[PDB]
Design a protein around this ligand. Structure first.
Ligand SMILES: *[C@@H]1O[C@H](CO)[C@@H](O[C@@H]2O[C@H](CO)[C@@H](O)[C@H](O)[C@H]2NC(C)=O)[C@H](O)[C@H]1NC(C)=O
Ligand SMILES: CC(C)CCC[C@@H](C)[C@H]1CC[C@H]2[C@@H]3CC=C4C[C@@H](O)CC[C@]4(C)[C@H]3CC[C@]12C
Ligand SMILES: *[C@@H]1O[C@H](CO)[C@@H](O)[C@H](O)[C@H]1NC(C)=O
Ligand SMILES: [K+]
Ligand SMILES: [K+]
Ligand SMILES: [Mg+2]
Ligand SMILES: [Tl+]
Lengths: 39, 268, 992
C-alpha cells in the first residue's frame, strides 16, 4: 500500500520455523522407516 | 620430477586450466541470472533493516565519548567525524532547483514522488540547512551530539498518537508530523537540549519516503542535534537517546535499534 | 634378545643315570636333602614363569593424543586460548568465542583419542596361559620320602614322580618308568600318547623317550625322573618367553592411516603458515593473524575422519562376529584382505584332529569311506556279504566305547574311551551299521587276547549271534603282513577260497597304495571254529594257545588317517585363486604332512619334489636339477642346519611348500622368512606350538573349538566354529573394507575445500566471512558422519577375490589420485556452490557482489552502526551480522546439498550408480538424517545463540542444487571414460 506498507518490512519467521521443524521431523521419521527395513 | 614426466605435467596443466576456466564461466553465469532477478531501485528483502537504527556522528570508541575540556587534542578526534557528517549538509552542495527543493520550514507530511520507477528523473529531495542545528569547532565543553535515523527505501516513519500516556507527556506534541527523540539516563545529573528542523526535537516527515541511491542521489536525511550542557563533571554518564513511533522498535541484542548508547565523561 | 630363543635346544639325555646325578648333586633313590633343595631354590630361583613388562594404559591413551591431527587441533585449541588471553587483557571482550572454541577443540582431541585407542587394542595374556600349565603342586622324593610340595619350590636335581592324569611339573630326565605314556601335543601339536622310559632312544632330545617336558601331561602309567630344567629355562618356558616377548608391530592398516595423516598434516601446515605470512604482508594485526590460523587449522583437519575409520572397522567386525569369526583386534579386520601368504598348521586346523577310516580293501577292491565331519560324501558298499564280515570284526575285535550321555551329539564328534585306531573303527561301524553296542550284545565275547607288542595282533572269540549256529567265532586284527601269514582262505564276495599268489599280490598292491596315501593300514581276518571240536561249554585259554591262530580266513584291509575338515580343500583353492600362497607348517611327520598337502591342495596334482623326481627317474637326488621341482618337503632336522638366507631361497624357489616336524621356534622362523621377502602373512593354528608364529604373524587366526587357550591368546582372530571357509570370507571382507575406506575418506576430504576456500577469499578479497569455524565442526562432526560411515556397507564393484593381493608398498589407502579428485575437482565445485549461496543471500538483502570487495573493514567495525548497502540503506552492527550468520547457515546447507551428490559418486570408484544401484539402506538413511540434522540446526529456536545458525528461507535451500547436479554428471561422465578405456589417462589420474 501507500503510507500503510508495513508488510514490506515484515517476515513470518515464526511460521517458517514451524514448517522447517515439521519437515526436519518428517525427514527424520522417513529415514528411520528406510533404515528399519531390516535393521 | 616429483610426480610425473614433463608430458604428464603438461596434460595435468591443460586439464585444470580448461576445467577451472569452465567452472569460473559457470559461476559467473549463475551470478548473471541472480542479478537478472533483482531490481535496480529496490532490494528483494528489507525485513533485516526493518526497525530503523539510530546512529550518531561522534565516533564512539565503545559507545563512549570521554575527553578533557582543559585539553585541545582530547576532543579533536570526535570533531573529525562530527565535521565529516555536517560537511555534507553545506549550502554549496544544495544549489539550484535540481535536484533539490525548498520544503516547509516546519515539520510537514510525507511526499510521494510516484513509484520506485525510472519513469521520472532524479526524484527531488528536500533541502536541509545545517543552520537549523543551533549552537552547533564544536562543543569543547559539554558535547553537541548529532543524531540520525537510518535510511530505508519506502519507509514511512509514523509518530505515536496522543491517545494514551507518553514519556514526554504531551509537551510540544506535533502528533501529526514529528518523530520524537528524547534522551535520558534517577541519575538525572545533566541538561538535555534538542535542536532540529522547525525547532522541534524530532525528524520532519517531509523527508520521506526515501527512494534509494539510484533514484535519489545527493538526497539529505534530517538531523537532530542534541546538546548536553550538564552541570556535572568527571564521571561516566550513561545517556540513552530513544526514538518513538509506530514503526519503531528495539532489541536487547541490537543496542542501536532505534536508540543510542553514549557514555559521556568531561573528565576535566 | 630373543634370537637365543629362536634356536634349537641342547640337552643331557645322552648321559647315564648316575652321570646325570653328579651334574645336579642328586640321589637317584633318596632324592635331595630338605636343606640342599632350599639352597638350590635361593640359587636358581623359583620354578615359575614371569610375565614380560607391559606398557601401562596411561601411556597408551596419551600416545594417540599426539598423532598429526591431534597435534594440529592442539595448536588450534591453545591458539584459541592465546587470542582469548590477548583479548581479556587489551579490550574487555565479554564474548565467549575463543574460550569456548578452545574448550570444544580440546574435547574433540580427547574423544578422538578414545577412538584411536579403541582401534589400537592389544589383548595379550600369552604368559598367563603358559603359567596355567604348571601344576599347583608336585610330588618329590626328599630324604628318601615322597611329599607334595608347591611346584614353584621344585629345583634342578630333585627326584620327581608323575602318574596318569598329572602335568609334568618341570623338564625331567626319566630314570624309572612303568607303562608311562605322555601327551607331547604341546611341542608337536599331535596328541597321540608317547611312551617314556629311562633308555635313550634318539640323538634329538625332543624325540627321545628318556625326557619328559614341562607343558605336557602324563596320560597313563607312572614315572620317576630328575629335574634338569626349571621355570624360564625349560624347553616350553623359553617358548613362553619367546611368544610373550615378541614385539607386536604395526599392522598394514595402521601404516596406511599414519601415511595419509602425514599427507593431510603436510598440506595443513603448508597452507597454514603460507597464509599466515600472506596475511601479515597484507598488514593484518597478529591479533587477527592467529584467528585466521585457527580457522585454517579447523578447515584442513578432517575432525571426524579417524573416528569414521574406527566405526567402519567396528561394523565390519560385527558382520564377521555373525559368521562365528571373532575379532580381538579391530585392525585385524583388514590384514586378512592384504594377506599374500598363509602359513598353516595341519592338525586341528586343516585337519579334524581325529583318526578316521579312509579306505577299505575287500573283494579285491579299494573302497573309499566318507571322512568329512558332517558326512558330505556318499556310500561305498553295503551289499557285499564280505562287508558284513569285515564290519563284524571291526565292531567285535574292538575294545573302544562311547562315553556316557553322548547320544545327543553326532557320532564322529562324540568322545571315545580308547586308542585312536579303535575309536576310528568304532565310529566307522556305528555310522554305517547302526549301534555297535548291539553287535557286541548279540555276539557275547567269551575270551580275548588284547593287542600285544610281540603278537602284533588282537584276537577275540564270540558266541555267533546266529541261532542255527550259536557256535564260536574267532576274529583278529593287526599288522597287515602279520595277518596275511595267518590266512589260508579269502572271503570273496561271500564265499571263501584258497589264498593264491594272485590275490596275495593284489593285497600287497592295495597295501602299498593305502600306505602311500599316508594312511595307517590294518588287517582283518576271522575263523569259524569247527563245532565238533568246540562244545558249547569248551573253555578257551588266553594265556596259552588253546585254539588255532593259523589257516584263518582273511576278510579285508582298513586304512585310516586324521582327515581334512570338509571345507578345507575348497578354502585352500579359493585362497590360491586370490593369489595367496599357502604353506604348510607342522610338527607332524613328513609322510603324513605331505599326504594331507595333496589332499587339501597345498601340493597340486603333478607337482614334484626333488625326491619324487629321483625315485621316478631312478637316479641320485644330487643328479636332479632342483629347479625342476616346484614342490618341496623340508624336515625340521634339516631346517635346523640351514641359514636364513638358504631358507629364503627355499621360499623363493618353490610354489608349494611343506615344512614338517618343525619346532615352535621353527614356525616363527618360517613366518619371519616370508615377511622378510616383503609379504603380509597370516598364520592359522590351534596348538600351543603355534603361539610364537601366531604372535609374529601380521594376523594370527586360531581355531575356537579345537584351539588351545594359548593359541587363542596369541591370535588376532578366532574361528568359533572351526569353519576354515571363514578365512576366505575374511580375506574378502578385508579387501572390501579397504576399498570402502577409500570411498569414505575421499567423501570426508572433499568437504575440506569448501571450508578452506572461504577463509582464503576472506583475506585476499576483504569480504565478509562466508563460513565460520563453528559451522565447519557442524559438518565434520555432524552432518558428514553418518553418510561417511554408510560407505562401509558398499558391495563390491567387481569380483575382488579374482584380483591379486595389494602391494603394500605401491597400493596405498590414500594416494595422489584421491587428493586430485577430492581436493582439485569435486571439492572445488562444492566451494563455488557455497560461495554462490553466500552471494545470493547478501545480494537479496541489498549487498550486491560488486560492493562487497574490501568492505570487511567497515563490516566488522562494531562502532559503525550505519554501513551503506548497494541500494543506499543503512545497517547497524547486529543487523548485518544476522545476514552474515545467515550466510554461514546457507553455506553450511550448501555443503550438505553438494555432499548429497558426493555421497552418491563416492559410492562407486569405477561402476556407474545405474549399475551398482541404490541398495545401501544405511547410505539412504544417511541422506535423510543428514538433511534432518541440517534443517533442525537452522530452524530450531535457540540455535542462533549456541551455534549462530539462522533460519533459511525456502529458496535458499536450492542455491547449490545446480552445483550438486554438476558433480553427479561430471563424475558419471568421468567414470564412463574409465570403463570405456582401461588404457590409463582418466584411470591413472583419478582412479582412487
Ligand atoms: C562545508 O562547510 C564547511 C563549514 O565549516 C567548510 O569549511 C570551511 O573551510 C574553509 C577552508 O578550509 C574555511 O576557510 C572556512 O572557514 C570553513 N567554513 C565556511 C563556512 O566556509 C567546508 O569547506 C565545506 N565543504 C565543502 C566540500 O564545500
Ligand atoms: C583456491 C584456489 C586458488 C586454489 C587452487 C589450488 C590448485 C592449484 C591445487 C588444488 C589441488 C592440487 C592438485 C592435487 C593433486 C595433484 C596430483 C599430484 O600427483 C600432483 C599435483 C596435483 C596435480 C595438485 C596440483 C595443484 C592443485 C590442482
Ligand atoms: C548557543 O549560542 C547562542 C548564540 O548563537 C547563545 O546565545 C546561547 O547562549 C548558546 N546556548 C547555550 C545553552 O550555551
Ligand atoms: K599377530
Ligand atoms: K570435511
Ligand atoms: Mg594343530
Ligand atoms: Tl575440516
Amino acid at each position: 500500500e501507500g503510507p500503510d506498507n508495513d508488510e514490506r518490512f515484515t517476515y513470518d519467521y515464526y511460521r517458517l520455523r514451524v514448517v522447517g521443524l515439521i519437515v526436519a521431523a518428517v525427514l527424520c521419521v522417513i529415514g528411520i522407516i528406510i533404515l528399519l527395513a531390516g535393521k | 620430477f616429483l610426480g610425473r614426466t614433463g608430458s604428464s605435467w603438461f596434460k595435468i596443466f591443460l586439464f585444470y586450466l580448461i576445467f577451472y576456466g569452465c567452472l569460473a564461466g559457470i559461476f559467473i553465469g549463475t551470478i548473471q541470472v541472480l542479478l537478472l532477478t533483482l531490481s535496480d531501485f529496490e532490494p528483494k528483502y528489507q525485513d533485516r533493516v526493518a526497525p530503523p537504527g539510530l546512529s550518531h556522528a561522534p565516533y564512539a570508541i565503545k559507545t563512549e565519548i570521554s575527553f578533557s575540556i582543559s585539553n585541545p587534542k582530547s576532543y579533536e578526534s570526535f570533531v573529525k567525524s562530527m565535521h565529516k557528517l555536517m560537511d555534507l549538509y553545506n549550502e554549496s552542495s544544495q544549489a539550484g532547483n535540481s535536484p533539490f527543493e525548498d520544503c516547509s520550514d516546519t515539520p510537514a507530511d510525507y511526499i510521494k514522488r510516484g513509484d520506485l520507477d525510472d519513469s521520472q528523473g532524479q526524484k527531488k529531495a528536500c533541502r536541509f540547512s545545517r543552520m537549523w542545528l543551533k549552537n552547533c569547532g564544536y562543543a569543547e565543553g559539554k558535547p553537541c551530539v548529532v543524531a540520525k535515523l537510518n535510511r530505508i527505501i519506502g519507509f514511512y516513519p509514523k509518530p505515536l498518537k496522543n491517545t494514551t500516556d507518553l514519556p514526554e507527556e504531551l509537551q510540544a506534541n506535533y502528533n501529526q508530523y514529528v518523530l520524537p527523540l528524547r534522551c535520558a539516563a534517577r541519575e538525572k545529573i545533566g541538561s538535555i537540549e534538542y535542536f532540529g528542523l522547525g525547532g522541534y526535537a524530532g525528524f520532519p516527515l517531509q523527508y520521506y519516503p526515501y527512494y534509494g541511491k539510484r533514484l535519489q542521489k545527493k538526497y539529505l536525511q534530517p538531523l537532530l542535534a542534541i546538546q548536553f550542557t550538564n552541570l556535572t563533571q568527571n564521571m561516566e554518564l550513561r545517556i540513552e537517546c530513544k526514538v518513538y513511533g509506530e514503526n519503531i522498535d528495539y532489541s536487547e541484542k541490537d543496542r542501536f535499534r532505534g536508540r543510542f548508547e553514549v557514555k559521556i565523561e568531561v573528565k576535566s | 634378545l630373543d634370537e637365543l630363543k629362536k634356536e634349537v635346544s641342547m640337552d643331557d639325555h645322552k648321559l647315564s643315570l648316575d652321570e646325570l646325578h653328579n651334574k645336579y648333586g642328586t640321589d637317584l633313590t633318596r632324592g635331595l636333602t630338605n636343606a640342599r633343595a632350599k639352597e638350590i631354590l635361593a640359587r636358581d630361583g623359583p620354578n615359575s614363569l614371569t610375565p614380560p613388562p607391559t606398557t601401562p594404559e596411561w601411556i597408551k591413551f596419551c600416545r594417540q593424543l599426539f598423532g598429526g591431527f591431534s597435534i594440529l587441533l592442539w595448536i588450534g585449541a591453545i591458539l584459541c586460548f592465546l587470542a582469548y588471553g590477548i583479548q581479556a587483557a587489551t579490550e574487555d571482550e565479554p564474548a565467549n568465542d575463543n574460550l569456548y572454541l578452545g574448550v570444544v577443540l580440546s574435547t574433540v582431541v580427547i574423544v578422538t583419542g578414545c577412538f584411536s585407542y579403541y582401534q589400537e587394542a592389544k589383548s595379550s595374556r600369552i604368559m598367563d596361559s603358559f603359567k596355567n600349565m604348571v601344576p599347583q603342586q608336585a610330588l618329590v622324593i626328599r630324604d628318601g620320602e615322597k611329599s607334595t610340595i608347591n611346584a614353584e619350590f621344585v629345583v634342578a636335581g630333585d627326584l620327581v614322580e608323575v602318574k596318569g592324569g598329572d602335568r609334568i611339573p618341570a623338564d625331567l630326565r626319566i630314570i624309572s618308568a612303568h607303562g608311562c605314556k605322555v601327551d607331547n601335543s604341546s611341542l608337536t601339536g599331535e596328541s597321540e600318547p608317547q611312551t617314556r622310559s629311562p633308555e635313550f632312544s634318539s640323538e634329538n632330545p625332543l624325540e627321545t623317550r628318556n625326557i619328559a617336558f614341562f607343558s605336557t601331561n602324563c596320560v597313563e602309567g607312572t614315572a620317576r625322573g630328575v629335574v634338569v630344567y626349571t621355570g624360564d629355562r625349560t624347553v616350553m618356558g623359553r617358548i613362553a618367553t619367546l611368544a610373550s616377548g615378541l614385539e607386536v608391530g604395526r599392522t598394514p592398516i595402521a601404516i596406511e592411516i599414519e601415511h595419509f595423516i602425514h599427507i593431510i598434516t603436510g598440506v595443513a601446515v603448508f597452507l597454514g603458515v603460507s597464509f599466515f605470512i600472506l596475511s601479515l604482508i597484507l598488514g593484518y594485526s597478529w591479533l587477527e593473524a592467529v584467528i585466521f590460523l585457527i580457522g585454517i587449522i579447523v578447515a584442513n583437519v578432517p575432525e571426524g575422519l579417524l573416528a569414521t575409520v574406527t566405526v567402519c572397522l567396528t561394523l565390519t567386525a560385527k558382520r564377521m562376529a555373525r559368521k562365528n569369526c571373532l575379532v580381538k583386534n579391530l585392525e585385524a579386520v583388514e590384514t586378512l584382505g592384504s594377506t599374500s601368504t598363509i602359513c598353516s598348521d595341519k592338525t586341528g586346523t586343516l585337519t579334524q584332529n581325529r583318526m578316521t577310516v579312509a579306505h577299505m580293501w575287500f573283494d579285491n577292491q579299494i573302497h573309499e569311506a566318507d571322512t568329512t565331519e558332517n558326512q558330505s560324501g556318499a556310500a561305498f558298499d553295503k551289499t557285499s556279504a564280505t562287508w558284513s564280515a569285515l564290519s563284524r570284526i571291526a565292531a567285535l575285535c574292538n575294545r573302544a566305547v562311547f562315553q556316557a550321555g553322548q547320544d545327543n551329539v553326532p557320532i564322529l564328534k562324540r568322545s571315545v574311551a580308547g586308542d585312536a585306531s579303535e575309536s576310528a573303527l568304532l565310529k566307522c561301524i556305528e555310522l554305517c551299521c547302526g549301534s555297535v553296542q548291539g553287535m557286541r550284545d548279540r555276539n557275547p565275547k567269551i575270551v580275548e587276547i588284547p593287542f600285544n607288542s610281540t603278537n602284533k595282533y588282537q584276537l577275540s572269540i564270540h558266541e555267533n549271534e546266529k541261532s542255527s549256529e550259536s557256535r564260536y567265532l574267532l576274529v583278529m586284527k593287526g599288522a597287515p603282513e602279520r595277518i596275511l601269514d595267518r590266512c589260508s582262505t579269502i572271503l570273496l564276495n561271500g564265499a571263501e577260497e584258497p589264498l593264491k599268489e594272485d590275490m596275495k599280490e593284489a593285497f600287497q598292491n592295495a597295501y602299498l597304495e593305502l600306505g602311500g596315501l599316508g594312511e595307517r593300514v590294518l588287517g582283518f581276518c576271522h575263523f569259524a571254529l569247527p563245532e565238533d571240536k568246540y562244545n558249547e561249554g569248551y573253555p578257551f585259554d588266553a594265556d596259552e594257545p588253546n585254539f588255532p591262530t593259523t589257516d584263518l580266513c582273511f576278510v579285508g584291509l582298513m586304512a585310516m588317517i586324521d582327515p581334512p575338515r570338509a571345507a578345507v580343500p575348497d578354502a585352500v583353492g579359493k585362497c590360491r585363486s586370490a593369489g595367496i600362497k599357502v604353506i604348510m607348517v607342522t610338527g607332524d611327520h613328513p609322510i603324513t604332512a605331505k599326504a594331507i598337502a595333496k589332499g587339501v591342495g597345498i601340493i597340486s596334482e603333478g607337482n614334484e619334489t626333488i625326491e619324487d623326481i629321483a625315485a621316478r627317474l631312478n637316479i641320485p637326488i644330487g643328479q636332479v636339477n632342483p629347479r625342476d621341482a616346484k614342490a618341496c618337503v623340508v624336515h625340521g632336522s634339516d631346517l635346523k642346519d640351514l641359514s636364513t638366507e638358504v631358507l629364503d631361497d627355499i621360499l623363493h624357489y618353490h610354489t608349494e611348500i611343506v615344512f614338517a616336524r618343525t619346532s615352535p621356534q621353527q614356525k616363527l622362523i618360517i613366518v619371519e622368512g616370508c615377511q622378510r621377502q616383503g609379504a603380509i602373512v597370516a598364520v592359522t593354528g590351534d596348538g600351543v606350538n603355534d603361539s610364537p608364529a601366531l604372535k609374529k604373524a601380521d594376523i594370527g587366526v586360531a581355531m575356537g573349538i579345537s584351539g588351545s587357550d594359548v593359541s587363542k591368546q596369541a591370535a588376532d582372530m578366532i574361528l568359533l566354529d572351526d569353519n576354515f571357509a571363514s578365512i576366505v570370507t575374511g580375506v574378502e571382507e578385508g579387501r572390501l573394507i579397504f576399498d570402502n575406506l577409500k570411498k569414505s575418506i575421499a567423501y570426508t576430504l572433499t568437504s575440506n575445500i569448501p571450508e578452506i576456500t572461504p577463509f582464503l577469499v576472506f583475506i585476499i578479497g576483504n569480504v565478509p566471512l562466508p563460513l565460520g569455524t563453528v559451522t565447519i565442526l557442524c559438518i565434520d562432526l555432524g552432518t558428514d558422519m553418518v553418510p561417511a560411515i554408510s560407505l562401509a556397507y558398499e558391495q563390491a564393484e567387481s569380483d575382488i577375490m579374482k584380483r591379486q593381493p595389494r602391494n603394500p608398498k605401491t597400493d596405498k589407502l590414500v594416494n595422489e589420485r584421491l587428493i586430485s579428485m577430492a581436493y582439485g575437482q569435486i571439492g572445488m565445485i562444492q566451494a563455488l556452490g557455497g560461495f554462490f549461496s553466500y552471494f545470493v543471500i547478501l545480494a537479496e538483502n541489498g549487498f550486491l557482489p560488486m560492493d562487497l570487495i574490501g568492505k570487511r573493514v567497515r563490516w566488522d567495525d562494531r562502532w559503525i552502526s550505519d554501513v551503506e548497502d548497494s541500494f543506499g540503506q543503512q545497517w547497524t552492527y547486529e543487523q548485518r551480522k544476522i545476514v552474515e550468520f545467515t550466510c554461514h547457515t546457507s553455506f553450511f546447507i550448501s555443503i550438505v546439498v553438494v555432499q548429497w551428490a558426493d555421497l552418491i559418486i563416492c559410492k562407486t570408484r569405477r561402476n556407474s550408480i545405474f549399475q551398482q544401484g541404490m541398495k545401501n539402506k544405511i547410505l539412504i538413511f544417511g541422506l535423510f538424517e543428514e538433511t534432518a540434522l541440517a534443517a533442525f540446526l537452522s530452524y530450531c529456536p535457540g540455535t542462533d545463540v549456541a551455534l549462530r545458525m539462522y533460519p533459511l528461507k525456502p529458496s535458499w535451500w536450492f542455491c547449490a542444487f545446480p552445483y550438486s547436479l554438476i558433480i553427479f554428471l561430471y563424475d558419471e561422465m568421468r567414470r564412463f571414460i574409465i570403463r570405456r578405456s582401461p588404457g590409463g589417462w582418466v584411470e591413472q589420474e583419478t582412479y582412487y
